[PDB]
Amino acid sequence: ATCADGRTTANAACCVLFPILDDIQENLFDGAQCGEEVHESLRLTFHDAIGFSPTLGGGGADGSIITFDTIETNFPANAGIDEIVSAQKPFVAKHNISAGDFIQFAGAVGVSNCPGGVRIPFFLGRPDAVAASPDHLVPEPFDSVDTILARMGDAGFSAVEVVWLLASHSIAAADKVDPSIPGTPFDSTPGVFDSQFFIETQLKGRLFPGTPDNKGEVQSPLQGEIRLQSDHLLARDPQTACEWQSMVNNQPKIQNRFAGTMSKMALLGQDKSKLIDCSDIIPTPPALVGAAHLPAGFSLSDVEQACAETPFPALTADPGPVTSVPPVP
Ligand code: HEM
Ligand SMILES: [Ca+2]
Ligand SMILES: [Ca+2]
């Protein structure tokens, strides 16, 4: 079909997304960048969609975290979901689509801004949220591996699918894990969608950045990087360790699995055959910047290998001496 300004798309219903793309790129993503706002909106897709259980209830990706912010925003697990929700609300009100659609749309666009990023399939027509999500549906970093895999399993995800989704921590920081150091990223290149997250979580920890005693934090191998307790355990648990390691220096797999599982996540509580494919609206991501590497000063011996069938790949270390990682601006 051909839309108002001559831009085209497969299905005419998708035309409404064009002016919304333009607005959010300029006014939410600070000029189509891969910074905080993108990170924040990516997180939001999860906090929305994961509110779904065949036993416990919840409408999955339905925008209920926005429509029922008052309730959900005040779940312990949704700490710091405030700003994101409050930031997207004017766009939701102003524009032409449901909150469920907007949350996933912005997330997908946001990802497409990150170097090494991938186009996430996007479908239109989620109806307004019916009710709030029930409590206890959002995984926390201090949840054990069994609790995390059970919850994600209950939502519809296998163990390997969890690992694939955690590629999101490649473009991610923390504000509330250690409040003393807001904006501390989970890997060295928070503005690039790459495998550094899967590499650097496998390294032997060295120190606590910021303060030493926080719920859901373990020692990080790098100053200016934070390691979630959960990610640390997932890189090493027999259920997830080998798949985790398989992501290392494997950009095409990372892109493929992330796009596939994100689309599955975005469809939680929904029906693909009852939506319109609006995937061609999603822009083309910039190519990957940089190659897989150990941090400077590090070597293979600093990797705590935990995949029983397959050894950790050979990676070189960055030229020079050990160094920190700036908080996310
Ligand atoms: C599976 C268990 C998971 C746990 C326990 C977990 C935990 C966390 C925690 C504690 C933070 C920091 C929040 C803060 O203190 O500010 C965070 C950030 C983030 N999470 Fe995860 N997460 C999980 C899975 C996921 C998934 C499936 C996605 C999918 C998109 C995701 C996307 C993000 C992003 C993009 C950020 C960065 C937010 C920012 O930098 O502003 N996470 N996560
Ligand atoms: Ca929801
Ligand atoms: Ca990265």
Author numbering: 2 to 330
Which sentences did the original study use to describe this structure?
As already described for P. eryngii VPL, the main structural feature of the P. ostreatus VP1 crystal structure is the combination of the Mn oxidation site of MnPs and the high redox potential substrate oxidation site of LiPs. In addition to the Mn2+ oxidation site, VPs also present a lignin oxidation site, whose presence was detected using VA and RB5 as substrates. This site in VP1 would consist of W164, connected to the heme group via a long-range electron transfer (LRET). The indolic side chain of W164 in VP1 is largely exposed (center) allowing the collection of electrons from the bulky lignin molecule. In a similar way, the W164S mutation in VP1 resulted in a complete loss of activity on VA and RB5 (used as two simple lignin model compounds). The last change in this region concerns S180 in VP1, which is occupied by K186 in MnP4, thus affecting both the surface shape and charge. The lower lip in VP1 presents a clear negative charge and the shape of a wide reservoir, while in MnP4 it displays a less charged surface with a narrow groove (circles in Figure 5C). However, one of the main characteristics of the VP1 structure, when compared with MnP4, is the broader main heme access channel (whose lower lip has the shape of a wide reservoir), which could be related to the reported existence of a third substrate oxidation site in VP. VP1 is the most stable POD retaining over 80% activity after 10 minutes up to 60°C, followed by MnP4, VP3, MnP1, and VP2 (although the VP2 stability sharply decreased with incubation time). For example, we tried to correlate the POD thermal stability to the proline number and position in β-turns and to the effect of heme-apoenzyme bonds. This approach agreed with the fact that VP1 has 12 β-turn prolines (compared with a POD average of nine) and one more heme-apoenzyme bond (than MnP4) but could not be extended to other thermostable P. ostreatus PODs.
